[PDB]
RNA sequence: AAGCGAAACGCAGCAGACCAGGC
């Protein structure tokens, strides 16, 4: 984590769990095999007008 | 002077085909929403009203 | 001068032989 000034306004607990949830997103993510595909983002590819 | 019954001879198919010819080269749904209303107009029913 | 509905994202090498060829 990194916040402006180094002043990340939360206790190491509060950060900590954060940390935490988005750790257990990853392992949840790589388990189905699709952290790969999310790696690679820039996604922007529109084509849809009026019919 | 004025014509004689106006909107009694202005035919709806008639709107359709210059809707057509005027929207000649665009895309085709805006064709499409032009050219709805003259199709509904030329299939209108008038409701005979109170008695 | 004009005027209308007045978030988040540019790789990588063997090396060392031996042969043929170039001016
Ligand atoms: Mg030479």
Known sequence: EMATKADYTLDEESRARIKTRLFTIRQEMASRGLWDSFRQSERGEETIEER | ?51
């Open chain 2, 1 to 51: 002077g004025d014509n004689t019954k106006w909107n009694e001879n202005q035919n709806p198919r008639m709107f359709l085909a210059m809707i057509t010819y005027i929207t000649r080269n665009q895309p085709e749904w805006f064709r499409n929403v032009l050219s709805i209303a003259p199709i509904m107009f030329s299939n209108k029913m008038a409701r005979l009203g109170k008695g």
